[PDB]
Amino acid sequence: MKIVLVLYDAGKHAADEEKLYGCTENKLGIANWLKDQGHELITTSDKEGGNSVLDQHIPDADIIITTPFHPAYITKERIDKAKKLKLVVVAGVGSDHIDLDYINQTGKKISVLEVTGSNVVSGAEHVLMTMLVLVRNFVPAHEQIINHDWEVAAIAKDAYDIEGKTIATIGAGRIGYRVLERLVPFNPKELLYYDYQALPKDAEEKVGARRVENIEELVAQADIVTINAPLHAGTKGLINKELLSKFKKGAWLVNTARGAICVAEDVAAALESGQLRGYGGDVWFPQPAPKDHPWRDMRNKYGAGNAMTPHYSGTTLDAQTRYAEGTKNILESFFTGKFDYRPQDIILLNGEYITKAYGKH
Amino acid sequence: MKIVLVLYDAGKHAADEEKLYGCTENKLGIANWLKDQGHELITTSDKEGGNSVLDQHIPDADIIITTPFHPAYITKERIDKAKKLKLVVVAGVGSDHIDLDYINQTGKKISVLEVTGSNVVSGAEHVLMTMLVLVRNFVPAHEQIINHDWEVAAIAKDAYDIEGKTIATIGAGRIGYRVLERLVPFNPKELLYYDYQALPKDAEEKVGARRVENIEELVAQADIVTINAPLHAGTKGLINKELLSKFKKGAWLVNTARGAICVAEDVAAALESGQLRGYGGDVWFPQPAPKDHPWRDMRNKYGAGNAMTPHYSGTTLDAQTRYAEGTKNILESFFTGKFDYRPQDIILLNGEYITKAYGKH
Numbered sequence: 001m002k003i004v005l006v007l008y009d010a011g012k013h014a015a016d017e018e019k020l021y022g023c024t025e026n027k028l029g030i031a032n033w034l035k036d037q038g039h040e041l042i043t044t045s046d047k048e049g050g051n052s053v054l055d056q057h058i059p060d061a062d063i064i065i066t067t068p069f070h071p072a073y074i075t076k077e078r079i080d081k082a083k084k085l086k087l088v089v090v091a092g093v094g095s096d097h098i099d100l101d102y103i104n105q106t107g108k109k110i111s112v113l114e115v116t117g118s119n120v121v122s123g124a125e126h127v128l129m130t131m132l133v134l135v136r137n138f139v140p141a142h143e144q145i146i147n148h149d150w151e152v153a154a155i156a157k158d159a160y161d162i163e164g165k166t167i168a169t170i171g172a173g174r175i176g177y178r179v180l181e182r183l184v185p186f187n188p189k190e191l192l193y194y195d196y197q198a199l200p201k202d203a204e205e206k207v208g209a210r211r212v213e214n215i216e217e218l219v220a221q222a223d224i225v226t227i228n229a230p231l232h233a234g235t236k237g238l239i240n241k242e243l244l245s246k247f248k249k250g251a252w253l254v255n256t257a258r259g260a261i262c263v264a265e266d267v268a269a270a271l272e273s274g275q276l277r278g279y280g281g282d283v284w285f286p287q288p289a290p291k292d293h294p295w296r297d298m299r300n301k302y303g304a305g306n307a308m309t310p311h312y313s314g315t316t317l318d319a320q321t322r323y324a325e326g327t328k329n330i331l332e333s334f335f336t337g338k339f340d341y342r343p344q345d346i347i348l349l350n351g352e353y354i355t356k357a358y359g360k361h
Numbered sequence: 362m363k364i365v366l367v368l369y370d371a372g373k374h375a376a377d378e379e380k381l382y383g384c385t386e387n388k389l390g391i392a393n394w395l396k397d398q399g400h401e402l403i404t405t406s407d408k409e410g411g412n413s414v415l416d417q418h419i420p421d422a423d424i425i426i427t428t429p430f431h432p433a434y435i436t437k438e439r440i441d442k443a444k445k446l447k448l449v450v451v452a453g454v455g456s457d458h459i460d461l462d463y464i465n466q467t468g469k470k471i472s473v474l475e476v477t478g479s480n481v482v483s484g485a486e487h488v489l490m491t492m493l494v495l496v497r498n499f500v501p502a503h504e505q506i507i508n509h510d511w512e513v514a515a516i517a518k519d520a521y522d523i524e525g526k527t528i529a530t531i532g533a534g535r536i537g538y539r540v541l542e543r544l545v546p547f548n549p550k551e552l553l554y555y556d557y558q559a560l561p562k563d564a565e566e567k568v569g570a571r572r573v574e575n576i577e578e579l580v581a582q583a584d585i586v587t588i589n590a591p592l593h594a595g596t597k598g599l600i601n602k603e604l605l606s607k608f609k610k611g612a613w614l615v616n617t618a619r620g621a622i623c624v625a626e627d628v629a630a631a632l633e634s635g636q637l638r639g640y641g642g643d644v645w646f647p648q649p650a651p652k653d654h655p656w657r658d659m660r661n662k663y664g665a666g667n668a669m670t671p672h673y674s675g676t677t678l679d680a681q682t683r684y685a686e687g688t689k690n691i692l693e694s695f696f697t698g699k700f701d702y703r704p705q706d707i708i709l710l711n712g713e714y715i716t717k718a719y720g721k722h
């Protein structure tokens with residue numbers, strides 16, 4: 001079978017780290033296995049433009065392997081041309097770069113599988129880190145040191161402890177729950193969640209969380225809000241001007257989920273106006289983020305409150321080996337004809353939604 | 362009585378934030394309270410040089426109030442000129458900017474009091490933040506964004522999860538233990554500590570910590586080392602070239618304790634050479650840190666591994682009110698002649714060591 005693998009290029013950085021499996025140079029470390037199994041592997045990072053390498057090979061690819069950090073956007077237009085496509089794999093977590101609703105509406109017999117759980121710890125750590133960086137005003141503090149300055153008050157005037165703050169997560173699944181678990185020993189005033197899926201009651205009690213029934217009530221009382229739900233029709237553009245106006249004034253917002261859950265310019269305006277004290281995360285729409293994307297230069301009134309990074313929290317070296325192995329396992333389930341996928345990896349099975357986490361179906 | 366209060370200046374930043382008690386503009390909230398009692402309060406940030414405002418007032422100061430973030434260095438030379446000095450207060454935690462050994466060894470009848478516990482949560486939070494920032498390679502990641510670039514592999518090549526790492530604290534007192542507590546839900550491989558004061562078994566078991574009684578054995582197995590002991594003769598220069606050569610190669614080192622626990626040039630050489638992958642923290646010797654201090658510009662081979670900030674973790678707005686109130690309480694205990702200090706606040710009582718945490722006596 002013909003397999004098209006779209007990853008980020010490491011360029012000169014490939015020579016620095018052999019454990020960087022998630023790049024085009026290294027092919028998830030599964031190329032030997034795919035060659036021995038008798039398959040043809042096309043590897044590229046060229047995913048934009050009508051004559052990209054991706055588009056040249058879409059018409060007869062049996063399988064497309066993608067990765068969220070450099071996402072091949074498997075649009076309706078591409079799906080219609082993909083005459084042999086039977087399986088799309090996500091080397092990572094989050095399948096929103098594929099037009100899942102289109103596959104489902106047309107009933108096309110395409111399965112979509114992701115490596116659930118492979119980098120959920122990595123993401124939760126990044127949430128905790130970004131919360132602490134924003135609350136404690138770390139970015140301008142480090143900027144002072146490397147700019148050869150020293151002025152404690154310029155940092156302290158907007159630096160707080162996370163202790164005593166009320167923290168809310170939108171989405172309390174694998175990442176959201178792991179965030180709540182990691183926050184417990186920081187002595188927050190309270191931990192809150194909003195999710196149409198209730199936490200198991202034992203899990204709720206372990207972290208002292210309180211479920212809040214609607215999102216407006218959730219954000220209005222939160223000093224810190226974190227977004228940990230997938231991107232789907234019910235979350236696209238969820239964090240917009242109107243909802244942001246119901247946040248607690250001066251809240252901190254963290255989003256390692258998906259960029260498009262927020263309206264980009266609305267977040268930036270809330271930060272510039274003071275409605276938010278800070279925003280940070282690793283995810284953008286689209287990716288790669290253009291040089292002039294508004295989340296790069298946005299700041300609060302003090303010139304800070306920006307903890308943005310490129311999309312990498314789920315591609316730490318520890319995460320990469322896990323989602324590479326999980327990608328291999330998915331492919332093997334397909335190649336053998338067993339289709340013995342782990343239940344939690346299945347987004348679509350031959351066009352049908354199996355996941356419950358991408359809204360109600 | 363004549364009181365000399367040495368704090369940092371907030372300048373234009375005082376107007377941005379009324380909760381900034383710890384600057385010369387706002388005088389810990391005690392200026393009118395002192396004036397009403399008939400005391401003369403001299404407030405200054407001018408603390409260096411033979412005719413500094415501090416030195417002008419040392420000879421007849423009854424009380425000197427200091428703060429670690431802008432520390433008046435109460436050296437033996439100054440103590441010898443301080444003919445009326447009876448009490449040095451630390452608005453914060455850590456009394457090493459005072460020559461405690463000289464006071465004690467020469468029979469100077471000077472008490473030294475600090476606001477124990479007032480910002481130990483704040484410091485522990487900063488340790489967790491710095492560990493995450495270094496391990497997850499946040500600083501170059503944010504720099505890439507604000508420089509209008511996008512290259513996931515440039516960051517991922519040296520980005521790890523904290524999960525699965527072995528973490529060691531040198532010092533397991535209020536901050537060190539709070540660090541261990543916050544690390545538990547991050548699923549480290551193991552938590553280790555080295556302290557001449559053992560943790561109670563119950564405290565050890567709560568965080569799953571293992572005591573290591575030899576410092577070289579401790580650092581040799583640790584992916585991450587954090588310093589959480591006071592600065593005294595026993596810890597000054599403890600982190601030198603020879604001990605660093607026994608660190609695990611490519612370890613991360615966090616120091617929010619005191620800068621002079623490390624030999625500054627030895628740390629920088631270890632970072633540049635790769636013996637450390639990263640160093641970070643908020644504390645320097647001396648403070649303010651000179652523009653040429655080697656910890657400003659030091660980097661690892663990738664241009665990263667530096668998470669330095671100015672000394673602010675213990676002067677977040679949440680901390681400042683706690684140590685301002687604690688300073689007022691200490692002063693009242695002195696002025697009333699009750700001397701009913703909280704026992705945990707007493708470093709020296711009339712020259713004698715009461716604390717056990719500054720070495721054995």
Ligand SMILES: NC(=O)c1ccc[n+]([C@@H]2O[C@H](COP(=O)([O-])OP(=O)(O)OC[C@H]3O[C@@H](n4cnc5c(N)ncnc54)[C@H](O)[C@@H]3O)[C@@H](O)[C@H]2O)c1
Nearest residue numbers: 093094123171173174175195197229230256257313314357
């Ligand atoms: N930044 C990264 O590198 C990275 C890494 C992993 C995952 N992610 C993203 O995080 C998302 C969540 O990952 P996970 O492992 O926690 O997934 P998960 O499926 O375990 O949990 C998602 C939770 O979100 C809930 N949810 C769905 N819609 C919601 C809505 N409108 N409001 C509130 N809750 C809603 C779901 O019910 C579920 O409980 C992924 O889908 C992915 O987009 C990013």
Ligand SMILES: NC(=O)c1ccc[n+]([C@@H]2O[C@H](COP(=O)([O-])OP(=O)(O)OC[C@H]3O[C@@H](n4cnc5c(N)ncnc54)[C@H](O)[C@@H]3O)[C@@H](O)[C@H]2O)c1
Nearest residue numbers: 454455484532534535536556558590591617618674675718
């Ligand atoms: N960066 C900040 O703003 C900030 C804030 C608060 C405290 N600090 C610094 O952190 C230090 C510790 O604070 P704390 O509240 O945890 O103090 P603490 O007195 O509760 O704990 C200090 C621990 O260090 C141990 N110790 C002393 N010498 C040691 C040695 N050679 N090796 C190993 N352990 C040793 C002590 O036995 C004690 O258990 C303070 O003295 C201060 O210098 C910095």
Ligand SMILES: [Cl-]
Nearest residue numbers: 234235359360
């Ligand atoms: Cl929904």
Ligand SMILES: [Cl-]
Nearest residue numbers: 595596720721
């Ligand atoms: Cl000692």
